[PDB]
Amino acid sequence: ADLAFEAKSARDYAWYDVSSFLTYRVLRTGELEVRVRFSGFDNRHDEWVNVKTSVRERSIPVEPSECGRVNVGDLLLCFQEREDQALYCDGHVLNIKRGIHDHARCNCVFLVRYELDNTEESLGLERICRRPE
Ligand SMILES: [Zn+2]
Numbered sequence: 001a002d003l004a005f006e007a008k009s010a011r012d013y014a015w016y017d018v019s020s021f022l023t024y025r026v027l028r029t030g031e032l033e034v035r036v037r038f039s040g041f042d043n044r045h046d047e048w049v050n051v052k053t054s055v056r057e058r059s060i061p062v063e064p065s066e067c068g069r070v071n072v073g074d075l076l077l078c079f080q081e082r083e084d085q086a087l088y089c090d091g092h093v094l095n096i097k098r099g100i101h102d103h104a105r106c107n108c109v110f111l112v113r114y115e116l117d118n119t120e121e122s123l124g125l126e127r128i129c130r131r132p133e
Contacts, residue, residue: 004013004017004018004057004058004059005017005018005055005056005057005058005089006018006055006056006057006059006077007036007038007049007054007055007056007071008049008050008053008054008055008057009047009049009054010048010049010054011047011091012085012087013116014061014087014088014089015077015088015089015090016038016039016088017038017039017058018036018037018038018039018053018055019037019038019039019040020036020037021034021035021036021037022035022036022037022046023035023056024051024084025048029082031050032050032051032052033048033049033050034047034048034049034051034055034083035047035048036049037054040105041090055066057131057132058131058132059076059077059088059129059130059131060129060130060132061129061133062106062125062128062129062130063103064101064102064104064106064125065103065107065128067106067108067125069130070093070094070096070110070125070128070130071093071096071120072093072094072095073092073093074092074093074095074130075090075091075131076090076091076092076110076112076128076129076130076131077088077089077090077091077129077130077131078091078112078121078127078128078129079123079127079128080114080115080121080122081086088129089114089115089116090114090115090116091112091113091114091115091121092112092113092115093111093112094112094113094120095110095111096109096110096111097109097110097111106124106125106126108124108125109122109123109124110123110124110125110128111123112128
């Protein structure tokens with residue numbers, strides 16, 4: 001499979017799936033930014049994003065069978081749903097409460113610390129994605 005990517009928006013600090021890269025530019029600080037096209041979406045969404053900070057290989061869904069590779073301290077992309085918006089943003093696993101289950105569905109409860117505002121939330125596997133490698 002080909003490398004796929006996600007990019008961090010400087011508007012909301014959330015990660016979004018990238019369809020294609022249109023162009024690049026060098027700020028007079030020497031810092032590299034690329035123009036990205038976002039997945040399944042209008043083209044006023046196009047954004048300049050920093051290459052090193054805001055572009056990375058796409059996050060990976062975790063099957064119930066592999067819920068055991070997610071440990072504490074681990075970095076995850078977490079589906080954060082709040083007062084009317086739902087963003088995918090970084091968080092780290094503070095605690096894991098293992099449940100009894102099988103291949104079909106995971107019922108483990110992961111307590112996550114969101115990186116930005118530092119709030120916390122308890123997520124299930126169905127709402128997180130792991131980092132490659
Ligand atoms: Zn589990």
